[PDB]
């Protein structure tokens, strides 16, 4: 934000706007600014759009560093302590709506994290320890799955009676589902098999298929029953909109 005529204003993917420069600057490469959270902070870049960082200071003895990506679509709005090494915020938004905001502890170690997917679905971790473990939950449209986290993966659990469903997401985005029932009678014990190819879990009881639980790309879950003998799917897959519908499929 330098001038109306000079210092062009470009639309920044992250609900922000950085104003470049017209011709150029005094000693070096282009310059630019942008007002962030009622406390505009200026900085100087190299190119003519927003491909550069924006330094600054806080309203309460701290710092701020808007490290705008080189492609104009990945605001990395940092907010260091006051020295410029210890952090207290790090909400990295993106063009397609992606967004991963973090909060740290009294030593720059990440404490909390909240990943928001393009489609709005969220994945929030809290109480993150040094090892990488912590409380976790996923916000889907209509309900919320709770679970835990480890440097290895995230595990959302849904319990219904003696059956316990587990949705794992590798710290790489890979989804896989498991199902266990402590019941020992073949007549009633529920068991399942995950098909990574079709991304679906097929529940079986006493050798018979009962239902297909599909974990879609759009972060949703659908349920379809088989015919009475378990020889083929029947009807139409139905979208799960409530936590209870899930606990229902597990009965």
């Amino acid at each position: 934000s330098l001038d109306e005529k000079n210092s062009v204003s470009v639309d920044l993917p992250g609900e922000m706007k950085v104003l470049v420069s017209k011709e150029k600057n005094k000693d070096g490469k282009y310059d630019l600014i942008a007002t962030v959270d009622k406390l505009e902070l200026k900085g100087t870049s190299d190119k003519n759009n927003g491909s550069g960082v924006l330094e600054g200071v806080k309203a309460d003895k701290c710092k701020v560093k808007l490290t705008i990506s080189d492609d104009l679509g990945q605001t990395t709005l940092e907010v260091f302590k006051e020295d410029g090494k210890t952090l207290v915020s790090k909400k990295v938004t993106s063009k397609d709506k992606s967004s991963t905001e973090e909060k740290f502890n009294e030593k720059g170690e990440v404490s909390e994290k909240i990943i928001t997917r393009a489609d709005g679905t969220r994945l929030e971790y809290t109480g993150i320890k040094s090892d990488g473990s912590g409380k976790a939950k996923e916000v889907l449209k209509g309900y919320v799955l709770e679970g835990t986290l480890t440097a290895e993966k995230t595990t959302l659990v849904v319990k219904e009676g003696t059956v316990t469903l587990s949705k794992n997401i590798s710290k790489s985005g890979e989804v896989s589902v498991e199902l266990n029932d402590t019941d020992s009678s073949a007549a009633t014990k529920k068991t399942a098999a995950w098909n990574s190819g079709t991304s679906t879990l097929t529940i079986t009881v006493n050798s018979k298929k009962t239902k297909d639980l599909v974990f879609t790309k759009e972060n949703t879950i659908t349920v379809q029953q088989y015919d009475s003998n378990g020889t083929k799917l029947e009807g139409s897959a139905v979208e799960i909109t409530k936590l209870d519908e899930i606990k229902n499929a597990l009965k």
Epitope: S185, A186, A187, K189, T191, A193, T204, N206, S207, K208, D227, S228, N229, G230, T231
Partner: antibody, heavy 113, light 108 residues
């Protein structure tokens, strides 16, 4: 409780037909397929085929095409195994099964003159 | 259909000992194997389902394990009355198939 009881021991002459019955009680006949298994001396247990109890469609195993038939009487929760043109290779014991936890007591068939 | 090659086809063990029968499928069967005990003149009795779950009504001397295409079943602390023919069964498919069976005899 749940039980599959079958018809008694049969003694037939070569070329005849035998119809084995399997009555289901204690569960909803229509919720499980119903399998048939052949137990020949020297052989272990071999699946002959199974039948969809909801629709009656029978699906046979390769070694049992032709002379064999699977039918049902839903009104009586009973399945049937038909074997026509009996040959000595048919003298053995036959079982019906449902799910993983039910087997009839089996029925011995002797093909002799 | 999926083949189940079970082995050995016959065992002769001493009382109190442990016996292991294995079953190899021609393809992944996702843990859907069951093991039955077949004593003469009676119907096959379910012992283990879903590769390792003990069906209620049976002593824990019976157990199973495995995954993919490879499974095993055991009888530990072999009792005098355990003689019988044991069978694996895959039911991952509608065309369920049986292993050849294993005759368990007592060595005394």
């Amino acid at each position: 409780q749940i039980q599959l009881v079958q018809s008694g021991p049969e003694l037939k002459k070569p070329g005849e037909t035998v119809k084995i019955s399997c009555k289901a009680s204690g569960y909803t006949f229509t919720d499980y397929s119903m399998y048939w298994v052949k137990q020949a001396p020297g052989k272990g247990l071999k699946r002959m085929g199974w039948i969809n109890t909801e629709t009656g469609e029978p699906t046979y195993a390769d070694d049992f095409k032709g002379r064999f038939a699977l039918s049902l009487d839903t009104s009586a929760s009973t399945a049937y195994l038909h074997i026509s043109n009996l040959k000595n290779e048919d003298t053995a014991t036959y079982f019906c099964a449902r799910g993983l936890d039910s087997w009839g007591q089996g029925t011995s068939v002797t093909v002799s003159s | 259909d999926i083949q189940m090659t079970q082995s050995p086809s016959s065992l002769s063990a001493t009382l109190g000992g442990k016996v292991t029968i294995t079953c190899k499928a021609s393809q992944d069967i996702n843990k859907y194997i069951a093991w039955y005990q077949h004593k003469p003149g009676k119907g096959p009795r379910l012992l283990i389902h879903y590769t390792s779950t003990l069906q209620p009504g049976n002593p824990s001397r019976f157990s199973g394990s495995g995954s993919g295409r490879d499974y095993s079943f055991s009888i530990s602390n072999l009792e005098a009355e355990d003689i019988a023919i044991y069978y694996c069964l895959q039911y991952d498919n509608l065309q369920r198939t049986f292993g050849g069976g294993t005759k368990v005899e007592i060595k005394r």
